[PDB]
């Protein structure tokens, strides 16, 4: 049994990380301007 509040907070941060990775790519990848 894994406490629900832990499941959300971990999957929560996990989403912020991957989504934050996308925003970084906006300044580095092909989607840049440099």
């Amino acid at each position: 049994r894994i406490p629900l509040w832990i499941v959300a907070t971990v999957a929560g941060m996990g989403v912020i990380v991957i989504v934050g990775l996308f925003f970084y790519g906006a300044y580095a990848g092909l989607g840049s301007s440099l």
Partner: peptide, 28 residues
């Protein structure tokens, strides 16, 4: 170069100071 090491610790610090409270059970 990779200060992601910092955030990580200070990031898990938040849920920790209440997780330890879920272990010692009290005052939530």
């Amino acid at each position: 170069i990779a200060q992601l090491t910092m955030i990580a610790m200070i990031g898990i610090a938040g849920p920790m100071i209440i997780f330890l409270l879920a272990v010692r059970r009290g005052n939530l």
